Amino acid sequence: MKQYLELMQKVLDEGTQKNDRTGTGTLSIFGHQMRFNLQDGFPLVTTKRCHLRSIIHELLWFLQGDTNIAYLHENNVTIWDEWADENGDLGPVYGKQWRAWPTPDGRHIDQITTVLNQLKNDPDSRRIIVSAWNVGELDKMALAPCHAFFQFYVADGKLSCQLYQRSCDVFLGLPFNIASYALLVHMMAQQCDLEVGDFVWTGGDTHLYSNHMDQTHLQLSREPRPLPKLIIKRKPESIFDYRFEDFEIEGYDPHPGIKAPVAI
């Protein structure tokens, strides 16, 4: 994608060498924003082949309020293996926080249901937010939330969404996160009889791992192709009733995949 490849280059030209948590070494910038008119097509990277099943199941896994990789395994998704404990648990990560944010007094808040109701009863609201950054449970998570904060917006019958990503792996994580959220907006818009608007991506520590340099240079020399089109084949009774089989992607003709190691 145009703006993705532009960021990829910005990191190379302006990045600062940082010794990170993993001890791998990164080239990073702080503060960046991108916008994606979803009307113009689904923002699934074409300069390299991405794989929907991993993106879709993780998202459905989230909406379920699940924090154990069991579900991801029944479905052949291995992305969260290196951080799961002996029993497959990751702690109160994304899913738990989206569906059951524990109040100080023992109650639980369902941010997704809250959001749905807001989009239906008070679309002008400036408080339609979902936060995964629960400070009280940070120490109990296998890895702190990278995509930590998102806000929805409605204007002219269109649904937009802005995500705040505190930490971003430009090569590996980014393509994933962008598609994952674009997909949620489409699911949100369908359940709220609204058209899709923009997907604004805002990042904090945006970096390129030092052992991804070759793959990056390889990716930068490929011309981006027309973005595909997402087609939702059914309208479930609720946002929680979506199955993998409901999503279809037309016209995705990407350049071959590029393999790269994950920093643990």
Ligand X SMILES: Nc1nc2[nH]cc(CCc3ccc(C(=O)N[C@@H](CCc4nn[nH]n4)C(=O)O)cc3)c2c(=O)[nH]1
Q: Which residues are catalytic?
A: 146
Residues for the chain: how many in total?
Answer: 264
Footprint on residues 6-65 left by ligand X (CB under 6 A):
51, 54
User: What is the footprint of ligand X within residues 143-162 (CB under 6 A)?
Assistant: 143
- Among ligand UMP, ligand X, a copy of itself, none, residue 260 binds (CB under 5-8 Å by kind): ligand X
Question: Measured from the CB of residue 192, what is the shortest distance to ligand X in angstroms?
Answer: 27
Nearest residue to 247 (alpha-carbon basis) of 87, 55, 21, 26: 55
Q: Judged by CB under 6 A, does residue 259 bind ligand X?
A: yes
Question: Smaller CB distance to ligand UMP: residue 143 or 232?
Answer: 143
- Indicate the residue whose CB is closest to ligand X: 173
Core vs surface per residue 114-124: b (16+ CB within 10 A) or e: ebbebbeeebe
CB of 236 to ligand X, least distance (A): 25
* Pick from 46, 1, 19: nearest CA to 256: 46
Closest approach of Cβ 190 to ligand UMP, in Å? 24
Residue ranges for the known binding site for dUMP are 21, 126-127, 166-169, 177, 207-209
Q: What is the DSSP letter of 62?
A: H
- Which tokens sit at 52? 């929907």
User: Which residues fall within 8 angstroms of residue 188, CB to CB, at 6 or more apart?
Assistant: 115, 116, 119, 152, 159, 161, 194, 239
Closest CB to ligand UMP among residues 11, 168:
168
